Amino acid sequence: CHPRLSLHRPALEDLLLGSEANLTCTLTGLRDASGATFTWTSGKSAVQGPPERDLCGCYSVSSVLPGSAQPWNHGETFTCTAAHPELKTPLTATLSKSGNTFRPEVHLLPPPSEELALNELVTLTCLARGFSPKDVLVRWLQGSQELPREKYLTWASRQEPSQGTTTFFVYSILRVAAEDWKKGDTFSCMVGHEALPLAFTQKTIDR
Amino acid sequence: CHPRLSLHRPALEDLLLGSEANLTCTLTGLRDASGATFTWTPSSGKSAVQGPPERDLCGCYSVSSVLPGSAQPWNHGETFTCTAAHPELKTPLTATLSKSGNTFRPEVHLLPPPSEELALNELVTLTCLARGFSPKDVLVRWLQGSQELPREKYVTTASRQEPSQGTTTFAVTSLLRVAAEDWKKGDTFSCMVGHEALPLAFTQKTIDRL
Amino acid sequence: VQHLYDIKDLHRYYSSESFEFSNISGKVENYNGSNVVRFNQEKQNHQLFLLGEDKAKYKQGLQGQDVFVVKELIDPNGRLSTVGGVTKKNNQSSETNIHLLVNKATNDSFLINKEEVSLKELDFKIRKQLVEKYGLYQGTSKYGKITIILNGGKKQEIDLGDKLQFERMGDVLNSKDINKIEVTLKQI
Amino acid sequence: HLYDIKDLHRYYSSESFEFSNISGKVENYNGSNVVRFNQEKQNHQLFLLGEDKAKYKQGLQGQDVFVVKELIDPNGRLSTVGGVTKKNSETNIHLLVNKLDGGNLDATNDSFLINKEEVSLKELDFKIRKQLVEKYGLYQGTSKYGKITIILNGGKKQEIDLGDKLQFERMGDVLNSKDINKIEVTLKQI
Numbered sequence A: 001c002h003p004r005l006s007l008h009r010p011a012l013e014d015l016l017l018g019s020e021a022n023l024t025c026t027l028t029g030l031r032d033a034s035g036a037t038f039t040w041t042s043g044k045s046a047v048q049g050p051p052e053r054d055l056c057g058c059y060s061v062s063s064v065l066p067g068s069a070q071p072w073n074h075g076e077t078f079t080c081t082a083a084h085p086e087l088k089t090p091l092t093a094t095l096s097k098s099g100n101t102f103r104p105e106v107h108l109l110p111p112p113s114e115e116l117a118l119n120e121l122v123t124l125t126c127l128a129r130g131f132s133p134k135d136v137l138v139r140w141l142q143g144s145q146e147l148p149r150e151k152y153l154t155w156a157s158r159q160e161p162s163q164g165t166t167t168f169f170v171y172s173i174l175r176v177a178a179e180d181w182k183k184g185d186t187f188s189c190m191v192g193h194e195a196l197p198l199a200f201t202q203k204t205i206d207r
Numbered sequence B: 001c002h003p004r005l006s007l008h009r010p011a012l013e014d015l016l017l018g019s020e021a022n023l024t025c026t027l028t029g030l031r032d033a034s035g036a037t038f039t040w041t042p043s044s045g046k047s048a049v050q051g052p053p054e055r056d057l058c059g060c061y062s063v064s065s066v067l068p069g070s071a072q073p074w075n076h077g078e079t080f081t082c083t084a085a086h087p088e089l090k091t092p093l094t095a096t097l098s099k100s101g102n103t104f105r106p107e108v109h110l111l112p113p114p115s116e117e118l119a120l121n122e123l124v125t126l127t128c129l130a131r132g133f134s135p136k137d138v139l140v141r142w143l144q145g146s147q148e149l150p151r152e153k154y155v156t157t158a159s160r161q162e163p164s165q166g167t168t169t170f171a172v173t174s175l176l177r178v179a180a181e182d183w184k185k186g187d188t189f190s191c192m193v194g195h196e197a198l199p200l201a202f203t204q205k206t207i208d209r210l
Numbered sequence C: 001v002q003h004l005y006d007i008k009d010l011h012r013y014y015s016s017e018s019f020e021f022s023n024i025s026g027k028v029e030n031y032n033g034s035n036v037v038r039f040n041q042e043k044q045n046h047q048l049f050l051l052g053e054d055k056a057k058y059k060q061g062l063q064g065q066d067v068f069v070v071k072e073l074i075d076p077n078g079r080l081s082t083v084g085g086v087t088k089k090n091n092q093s094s095e096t097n098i099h100l101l102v103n104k105a106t107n108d109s110f111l112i113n114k115e116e117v118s119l120k121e122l123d124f125k126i127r128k129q130l131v132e133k134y135g136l137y138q139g140t141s142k143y144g145k146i147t148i149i150l151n152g153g154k155k156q157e158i159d160l161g162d163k164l165q166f167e168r169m170g171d172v173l174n175s176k177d178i179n180k181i182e183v184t185l186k187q188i
Numbered sequence D: 001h002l003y004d005i006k007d008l009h010r011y012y013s014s015e016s017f018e019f020s021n022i023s024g025k026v027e028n029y030n031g032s033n034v035v036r037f038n039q040e041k042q043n044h045q046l047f048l049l050g051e052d053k054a055k056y057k058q059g060l061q062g063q064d065v066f067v068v069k070e071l072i073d074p075n076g077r078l079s080t081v082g083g084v085t086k087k088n089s090e091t092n093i094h095l096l097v098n099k100l101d102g103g104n105l106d107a108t109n110d111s112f113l114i115n116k117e118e119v120s121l122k123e124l125d126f127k128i129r130k131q132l133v134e135k136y137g138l139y140q141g142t143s144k145y146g147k148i149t150i151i152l153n154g155g156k157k158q159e160i161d162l163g164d165k166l167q168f169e170r171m172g173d174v175l176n177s178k179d180i181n182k183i184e185v186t187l188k189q190i
């Protein structure tokens, strides 16, 4: 077992849609998940959670720092030092909300002409690109009604080919009934990203 | 450290574009990686080659046997069984794999750039979509005219399972960004998709300003 | 450098419904680093973003102000996101009938209800009239200019090629200070 | 609808090759039987998918091949399907084309050549369609549908729909030139 310390940013889903958000400092690789102490950078009281195995045996413990949305969004730099008897010198991890952010360019693409001729299902494609950091949300609406997650597929945020600064992209395909598309009702891809002015943006499409 | 045996299929890129595709049998979770014996079935191809000990994702040792020249029996439908013996095993472990038989070919679609980008006269995004296929493994290449583009200039997403209404199928998108002036001038761009269910292994969709 | 590919979006936005709410109150909150004010009106949750000088002016929040809202979108939680459009809690009110000259020449008019009006409301109401009676954001009609001419010769201009910029929606004007409005529709 | 008219125009206007005296062992590629051969500084991949999979079970040993490119794969190999004919002079085959000149039915007598006795359906289909493309506006604008009908001495007949590329499994079918009686084409007006 080889103790490792990693600190995790607040989930974008919580920042933009939750009423709470937390940073999570995890210490993985523990043969005996006892006597782990976390202490950080002077706010609210951080809750440790229970021990837990990781992969290939071994254990791990985490410390969530509740109610961190506002400090995170203000530009605060967090530091988490974890002390344990299975490491020599307590390990440290720093993290702060990112500068050098870029808004996603959001596009929603019509179905391929071939699929329109098939007349069964048609594929709508949403593309968000040019954004950083890679964390992003994608939701779908038909008309003004949000579609359940189970009716579309969102790929992982991946780095773009670029000579220069790093940007990310994400695709999402929603397949709908050809009749719905041809009868003329709208479809919308909604994208959440911390660099957007209103946190969310939307593109809408129809024939 | 806990020993585990895994039998991995031949890479699609080797089956469709290489001379030498092979199966890999890996014994992970070893405390001492020497002393492993691998017995392959069918036993009528090139010799198996056991690799040097390797570290796995937790400080344990890993050793793998590759069965080269496997493309012929793999495509014939033979099932491969790999048996591994090791002092750290009470009894030998067995893993079995064969080429899938319930397969579906991809529906390949090349989508034009978003209207907005056609106003920027900078770069425009072309999107290749391959969907409805099984198994997951797929290859995607891009061409401009009749010239293959290097993969530094497009990014293909991982193959993922589609929202299903019974049968499992997968989908991939690939993003190629080209100069707007190339696109407006009339050049054609092709997505080339490789998949074992495709009649000729490869298929191609081509696009230009209609 | 100028195109017609976003015509449907502009037409949808400036033909959509607006709301003029009175006596709105709410405290300021941090949302994604932004200053927002959430309030419920007509059984609908709103999320007002304060992004221009309206950010500095409503540090505490809204304490009974008038708000001109336009749906930017309804987020996954059901909140209507709207930008700017806050004018002061006023104990005085009067009518200003504003002459609106539209050049493509046609005399129109535009009735304002309050003594302090938001540039957002002026922009949105003028454009909606242009969309519904003068063909704006239809066919090849997109570009042009709104010129708000103030008493004394000062002018304030809005380009029709894009939505009003979020940072300008919190700017306000004294209705009495408006002399007239001229619009020029430059079509192809 | 007409969504693939350009794919059909590219295919049936592309360059075809008539090779003779081709030999090659059958290899397994992606589970199918292929024969690879080099002609005119070009590597070819011939797919045997019809009944020719059984006909040429060993491979080729001097047969004639009519090559049409489905695609050039990333290794530079031209992939082609069927078109194999026997290992053992020109004939001019005549062709009636029924087109619609606005409001007039215009029947044209046309023809094309072949250099073999036993000829493959792939060759006949491709050559017919190429002249329909070149001289009659097929797979331009709105012209995509219609039928090629090949009548044979005695009455036997074979049809080919123009709305679809010829089926891969029908590219190993073969005929005798001398047994062809009529070949009539109707260009359906959409």
Ligand SMILES: *[C@@H]1O[C@H](CO)[C@@H](O)[C@H](O)[C@H]1NC(C)=O
Residues within 6 Å of the ligand: A011, A014, A021, A022, A024, A064, A066
């Ligand atoms: C901390 O935030 C993560 C983010 O997804 C969430 O899954 C978890 O339940 C939260 N836990 C606490 C104690 O706040």
